[PDB]
Write an enzyme that holds these catalytic residues in place. Structure first.
Site, mmCIF file in Angstrom:
data_model
loop_
_atom_site.group_PDB
_atom_site.id
_atom_site.type_symbol
_atom_site.label_atom_id
_atom_site.label_comp_id
_atom_site.label_asym_id
_atom_site.label_seq_id
_atom_site.Cartn_x
_atom_site.Cartn_y
_atom_site.Cartn_z
ATOM 1 N N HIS A 1 0.816 -1.213 0.000
ATOM 2 C CA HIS A 1 0.000 0.000 0.000
ATOM 3 C C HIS A 1 0.854 1.268 0.000
ATOM 4 C CE1 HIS A 1 0.130 0.504 4.570
ATOM 5 N NE2 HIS A 1 0.068 1.764 4.183
ATOM 6 N N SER B 1 3.988 3.227 7.899
ATOM 7 C CA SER B 1 3.656 2.122 7.006
ATOM 8 C C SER B 1 4.848 1.699 6.175
ATOM 9 C CB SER B 1 2.506 2.534 6.095
ATOM 10 O OG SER B 1 1.318 2.606 6.855
ATOM 11 N N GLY B 2 4.985 0.389 6.002
ATOM 12 C CA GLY B 2 6.077 -0.170 5.233
ATOM 13 C C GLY B 2 7.319 -0.489 6.033
ATOM 14 N N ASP C 1 0.058 -7.441 2.055
ATOM 15 C CA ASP C 1 0.549 -6.061 2.012
ATOM 16 C C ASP C 1 2.083 -6.057 2.103
ATOM 17 O OD1 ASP C 1 0.618 -3.376 1.849
ATOM 18 O OD2 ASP C 1 -0.130 -2.963 3.900
ATOM 19 N N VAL D 1 17.375 17.024 7.643
ATOM 20 C CA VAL D 1 18.732 17.565 7.733
ATOM 21 C C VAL D 1 19.709 16.550 7.161
ATOM 22 C CG1 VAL D 1 20.550 18.475 9.249
ATOM 23 C CG2 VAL D 1 18.087 18.832 9.839
ATOM 24 N N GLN E 1 0.163 6.340 11.031
ATOM 25 C CA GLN E 1 0.320 6.872 9.678
ATOM 26 C C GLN E 1 1.730 7.402 9.476
ATOM 27 O OE1 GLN E 1 -2.948 6.922 10.863
ATOM 28 N NE2 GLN E 1 -3.608 5.778 9.037
ATOM 29 N N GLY E 2 2.360 6.995 8.388
ATOM 30 C CA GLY E 2 3.712 7.414 8.088
ATOM 31 C C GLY E 2 4.761 6.407 8.478
HETATM 32 CA CA LIG Z 1 19.130 13.192 7.087
#
Ligand SMILES: [Ca+2]
Ligand SMILES: O[C@@H]1[C@@H](O)[C@@H](O)OC[C@H]1O
Ligand SMILES: O[C@@H]1[C@@H](O)[C@H](O)OC[C@H]1O
Length: 223
Positions: free
Chosen positions: A40, A177-178, A84, A57, A174-175
């Site tokens: 996904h 994922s994976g 998934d 950074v 959220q974020g």
């Molecule tokens: Ca960096």
């Protein structure tokens, strides 16, 4: 990651950030040219970012390498999130060192009760929104299949497992994922889904990587 802690720069050396102008998913380096993530998370134009801590950074250990090929699992279903998982090949081999390293694939599945390390740059609030710049970590146990199924009736397949805390407050989000779920030095899970984040009786749901080792290996051997 909600309720976790700051990992520390490059302490999770297999953690990758998938970047399409911005961080949008995690992944896991499994050899010098391949990353495993969630299906996904698929999109075109992926740059893989290794060696990251602060994703805003340049701190001196990054490797930025474009994807040459993405392979979503043949049986991925985006409605149920069954299967998934996806593989991403890098255009060039990453340079492996102590801060950028692959994570072993499992030789067996992990049992309920095993403690694991979950990490990502996802949302750190469960009722609210705050995205961290540095990598966050959560130590969490795998939950029993029965408590997983009772939390999410009619939705947990044999390719999924739950991990976290039924009381709430500690979860991926959220974020994330994976990204990885690593247990005793083996990649056992991929951050996949859940109802909200860190909610009571709604633990995180993870792709069960041990089911996919044969597909991963043969795919790598022929691409
Ligand atoms: Ca960096
Ligand atoms: O998890 C659920 C999935 O299995 C399906 O039923 O679609 C709705 C989702 O909430
Ligand atoms: O050399 C590249 C450098 O410019 C960037 O900052 O980090 C990734 C490297 O691939």
């Amino acid at each position: 990651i909600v309720g976790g802690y700051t990992c520390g720069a490059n302490t999770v050396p297999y953690q990758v950030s998938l970047n399409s102008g911005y961080h949008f998913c995690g992944g896991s380096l499994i050899n010098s040219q391949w990353v495993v993530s969630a299906a996904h998370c698929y999109k075109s134009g992926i740059q893989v970012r290794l060696g990251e801590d602060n994703i805003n950074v340049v701190e001196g250990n990054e490797q930025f390498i474009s994807a040459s090929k993405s392979i979503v699992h043949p049986s991925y279903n985006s409605n149920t999130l069954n299967n998934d998982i996806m593989l991403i090949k890098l255009k060039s081999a990453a340079s492996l060192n102590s801060r950028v390293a692959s994570i072993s694939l499992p030789t067996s599945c992990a049992s309920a009760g095993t403690q694991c390390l979950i990490s990502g740059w996802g949302n750190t609030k469960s009722s609210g929104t705050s995205y961290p710049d540095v990598l966050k970590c959560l130590k969490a146990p795998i939950l029993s299949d029965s408590s997983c199924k009772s939390a999410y009736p009619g939705q947990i397949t044999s390719n999924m497992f739950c991990a976290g805390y039924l009381e709430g407050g500690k979860d991926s989000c959220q974020g994330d994922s994976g990204g990885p779920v690593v247990c005793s030095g083996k990649l056992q899970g991929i951050v996949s889904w859940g109802s909200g984040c860190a909610q009571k009786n709604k633990p995180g749901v993870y792709t069960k990587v041990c089911n996919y080792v044969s597909w991963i290996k043969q795919t790598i051997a022929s691409n």
